[PDB]
Write a protein that binds this ligand. Sequence first.
Ligand SMILES: [Cl-]
Ligand SMILES: [Cl-]
Ligand SMILES: [Cl-]
Ligand SMILES: [Cl-]
Ligand SMILES: [Mn+2]
Ligand SMILES: [Mn+2]
Ligand SMILES: [Mn+2]
Ligand SMILES: [Mn+2]
Lengths: 380, 380, 380, 380
Amino acid sequence: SLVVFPFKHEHPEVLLHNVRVAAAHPRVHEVLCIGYERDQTYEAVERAAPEISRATGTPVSVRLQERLGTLRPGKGDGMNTALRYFLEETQWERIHFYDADITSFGPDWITKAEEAADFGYGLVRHYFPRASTDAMITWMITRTGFALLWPHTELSWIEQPLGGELLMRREVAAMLYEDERVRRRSDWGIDTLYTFVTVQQGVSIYECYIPEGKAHRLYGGLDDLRTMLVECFAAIQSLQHEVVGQPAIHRQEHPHRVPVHIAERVGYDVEATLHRLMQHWTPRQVELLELFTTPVREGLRTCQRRPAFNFMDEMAWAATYHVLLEHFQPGDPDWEELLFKLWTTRVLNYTMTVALRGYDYAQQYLYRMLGRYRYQAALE
Amino acid sequence: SLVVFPFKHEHPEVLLHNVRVAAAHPRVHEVLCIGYERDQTYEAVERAAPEISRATGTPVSVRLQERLGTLRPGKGDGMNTALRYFLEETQWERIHFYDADITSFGPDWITKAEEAADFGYGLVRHYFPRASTDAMITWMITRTGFALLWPHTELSWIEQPLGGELLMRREVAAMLYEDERVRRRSDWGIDTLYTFVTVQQGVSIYECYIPEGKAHRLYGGLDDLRTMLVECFAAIQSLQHEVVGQPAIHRQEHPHRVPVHIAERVGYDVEATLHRLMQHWTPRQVELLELFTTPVREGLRTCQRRPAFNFMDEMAWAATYHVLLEHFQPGDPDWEELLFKLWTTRVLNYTMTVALRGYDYAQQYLYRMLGRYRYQAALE
Amino acid sequence: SLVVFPFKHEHPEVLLHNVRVAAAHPRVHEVLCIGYERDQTYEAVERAAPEISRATGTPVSVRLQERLGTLRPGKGDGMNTALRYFLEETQWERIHFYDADITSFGPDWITKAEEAADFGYGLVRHYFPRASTDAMITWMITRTGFALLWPHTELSWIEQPLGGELLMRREVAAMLYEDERVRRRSDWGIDTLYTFVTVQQGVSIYECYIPEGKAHRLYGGLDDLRTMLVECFAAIQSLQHEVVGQPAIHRQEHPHRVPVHIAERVGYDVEATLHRLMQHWTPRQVELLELFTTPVREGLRTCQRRPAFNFMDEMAWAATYHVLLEHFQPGDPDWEELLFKLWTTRVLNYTMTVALRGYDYAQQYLYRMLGRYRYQAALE
Amino acid sequence: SLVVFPFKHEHPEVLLHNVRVAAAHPRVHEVLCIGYERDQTYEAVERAAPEISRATGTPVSVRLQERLGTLRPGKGDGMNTALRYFLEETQWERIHFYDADITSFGPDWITKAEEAADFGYGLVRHYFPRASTDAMITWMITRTGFALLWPHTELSWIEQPLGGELLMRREVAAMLYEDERVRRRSDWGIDTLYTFVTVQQGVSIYECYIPEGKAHRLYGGLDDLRTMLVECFAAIQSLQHEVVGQPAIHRQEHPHRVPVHIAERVGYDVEATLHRLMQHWTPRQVELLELFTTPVREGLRTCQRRPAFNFMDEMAWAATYHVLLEHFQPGDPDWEELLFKLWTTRVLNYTMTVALRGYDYAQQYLYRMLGRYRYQAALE
Ligand SMILES: [Cl-]
Ligand SMILES: [Cl-]
Ligand SMILES: [Cl-]
Ligand SMILES: [Cl-]
Ligand SMILES: [Mn+2]
Ligand SMILES: [Mn+2]
Ligand SMILES: [Mn+2]
Ligand SMILES: [Mn+2]
């Protein structure tokens, strides 16, 4: 197998430790790191690589990403360059991807994926325990979108549709590389696209549970997720007219109880988030709210003077999601700020009325949210 | 819809309460009770029925089961009688079954099933939280069997393959009642057969989670499960050469955290169970053990003098299961007793080495068990 | 024993149920309800009493509170009137108090307190499981005060020093009724005084765990807690030069795991709380902040424009507490509102950075909080 | 401070690690290891001392225990030799003891004990989270005894009265070493004796919570606790007529949630334990049962043929405890075997009816058990 680590700016020791782990693994025949640019990290890996490959007997290489997509040059270009490398320059049967900022990586992850793949699956997705306020794009954006647009499919049931840790066999990789919808998603939307297209093509999927979790880079206020947010949404919007006549085999490793240290952390800075909700207003944003239901429109307007979020419950969010699907303009700064404020209030609402009731309550709640979304969507 | 309660010997007030709940439900058009014989319970329901249907506007009736199968006349004959009544004597589009001895039934259960059916599913199964020592036939016999025999199918993933609580749509009922394999399963094997063939014909299945659990009749020593145990095993064994098939298609409501009162109970009497392990021995049973691996043969023999069960771990059990599949003679008193003792030691082993480590630990274990069994099966 | 229910405004059926429960108890010889005014509730009880007292054989009566203290006529006058009645007009050996608004009251509570009293203890205090956002005056005012001022004593170790549910023996009641420090506490400060002086007097104390919790009247925003906040702080402040001897007998029934329904609730409405933090400002309050450390002064100032609360950790709170003890003027509207805003940020800081982390986490944290406060006070 | 490690037979690397941790600690001035005999361990430590005593600047020495007591030469003689060395040959103000076989020791333990000492306490006891089937002597013998014989005292409230981990100040050590009751307890009984007399003399006690637990040597069947069992019982019996007539001050650090890895282990081998129950019978033992209540007499007699333990609930156990206190003969092999079997059935009972219900349930139970024992004792 080929193992890939896409990296942008990361601590060299962190990624070098992972590369080391993969190279040492009996089933890994090559490690590739795909860089955004020739930085500190790049230089480090390149210097370490020859040594590592000699030590482990398995070749390690670094490359810059190629520009293959048409949106912002980001993670997509990174991953798809790896798909190209894999398909056009190696003979390997399987490719793994793992995010480079992972600090809890172990041979573990590789073994479990390889063993599922031996069982027959086309795509193996790793998924992890999560803190109740983690994964707010995954839930409020990706899984929500999937539930609302494709209720009868397996899409909304994928646990971590955004997750960078996965194993594809060669023909699944070939299919994804050759698809032009995926190819052009050069930005953060890449994972959404891999997820959507493998499901739509009926690839059989296994979700692998990694118990010790995914310990990686942590967030301040919500707005260091802002690009990713707009991009992940734009990805769902771009797919909204797709049909998914059937269907994919899909099994999930049964999850263990969350580790305590993972359940007991806050995924973001509340005070800062509340503050930011009052900032970067624009007469045009105010005007754009004329497109939304009254509670949401009054709701968000209040945010110019003081934080408001009680209004953004489940039902308001679904209403908001439809208006966004239909009017949101990718790349318009006002639409992007508006989507950001809107998602913010959904996350604050959820944090204060649900997450604050406990880990378990908040999981019951998210699952039951998707179900309600699916039911509602199936009804029209 | 038609709602059916199969009853053998139960407290009239318990069943009458359930009937009342069903009849009151806005989506129920008929309630049917299927009795084993004309006993106390039967008489109670028959007297109450005319009154209840007048009170609720939906017809309620009682009938004896018909002899439709060829094994012991038991629950199968009751449920298949209901299928016949449903298909040949009503116009209804959906049939529910619920065990009569349920004391936590509410409109709840009916609504949830009817809603999933509206979504599109062909079979909706109710499943419940469980005490770590509950459902030992489900786990050690039914799900084990499905994992060992059909690893690439959805069979071993069904949560409660013995569950009496389900909704079928008319065409699914028609298909089952027509199937001779199922029709003949007059005994406890019926539920196994419903589970097996619906999966094998690619019916689409939703598992509904009932959070407040299923509070019903409780067990003393393991041996008041003994007929059920031999009959449920016989059912797996009778299907052992089937193939399969289609995919199809299977989704589970996400389970909530187990209620405390359900996690904090012991599902059987350990002392009695150890005692019973030493009883009903037979020279022929001692002989029949010659057919089993050494640790098991030596293990079970010790049980004539004192209780032994540490030998019966996962791998020993799987080995045992294969010898049983291939040599167990349904209806042979020595084979039945032996299966009983064998299974007892497995339950005891699980109780002392797994269940005693906690509710969570014991669930991780059982799920992981089925996975190991599936991996091992797919290896040959 | 005498059982007393102090009431101000409550639902008659709620209180009447409680009175009925007490009157039926084999150990209860008299039930007394102490009212604030002759309202609806009062009239209800007085009509119902003669019956009850006939139905159960134990006398039930209602009286208005007397004016005995010198602060706001509130709960203190209510409870001390009971003490006077108990001592001067009855021969009973033991008095219980229970809040009238309790909806989870049962013979239970009485039995457990009477049995501890039999063991010998002078005072028996009932304590309950709590939601992580409950009891923010208990924690951030009373237990905090106790730790910071009397670190070597048993004070900060009482679980629920504001608790209205307790049993005293006659001599304890006589001691309290005779103390003018307690007598004058006519307002909400009464429970703090009962707690303080029985500890100061080396009364032996037993804390009795009520597992089903105390289900009573719930709160909106934090600010319907305002009068109780300022009067509970005033109480601590009034005691600040007291010296407390050396630790008596104090024993606590071991707490069970919190019930899920109690752990899973939010104890207040976060939006309204953030809003209220920006209201009722005054140029004098702004000036008064010149008395506080820089972080807290700048922190609270920001609240005129947007909610700010991250500055208010543990140590800032302690610092602020010290400034309050020394400068807070009871009865001054600006000091009162200032105290209110200050507490509010302790509570918000704590909800966002600690409660959000889990029920367990937030309890570890509060206990470790008192310990850090004790250590710090001990240090000078 | 002097830190002492008593050792009999242990792995050098385990003990040597702990020695290293103590010596490195800024508050430790001398480390002493007290050995049973000049074995492997002894030789290892003696070789290493020197080296350690020298990379830390704090002297480390080993000695053989002296024969100071009059029972079996065991732990008592070791601990008391340490006391003697401490008092007669050093100037240090405080002595710690830690078990040698601990594998989770860290500077931690010493710091916490030293800081409590600094706060004033005369004895600091470390206590740890436990598996539900751990500590069966502590609960069913020591704490039970304390609760039945001294209900009004602090004795049964000490969390780990057998714990080897504690800090005494010089005067408390002096007092204990001077006490002939403790001096003669040369065997396992020593810890019971330190616990009893420090409480009896009104030494003020702090219990220190060590969250990471005490990882040490594990048990097979219950019978490798057999000498310890009889000696610990003998200890309580020898003290049965003592009077306890003052307050100790007694405070317990609030415990954190049990770590999962500690909650999820089985503390013994059930199958072996059941087998052992049927062994080493004797006509005299059968006779001696004549002294016990009928359920217990008939119950234990069944154990000659098959394991029986349902009879040994709480109340049977208390009854049995009283018969033992009054008739058990230390050093009589039949009384010793009988006590062992009796206690085994108690442990089995608690295991199957209680521990199997969950970690929390089992703790609620043990605490409530002492409660009931205390109430019952206080009633006569
Ligand atoms: Cl996310
Ligand atoms: Cl079962
Ligand atoms: Cl409070
Ligand atoms: Cl022990
Ligand atoms: Mn990341
Ligand atoms: Mn049943
Ligand atoms: Mn109240
Ligand atoms: Mn040990």
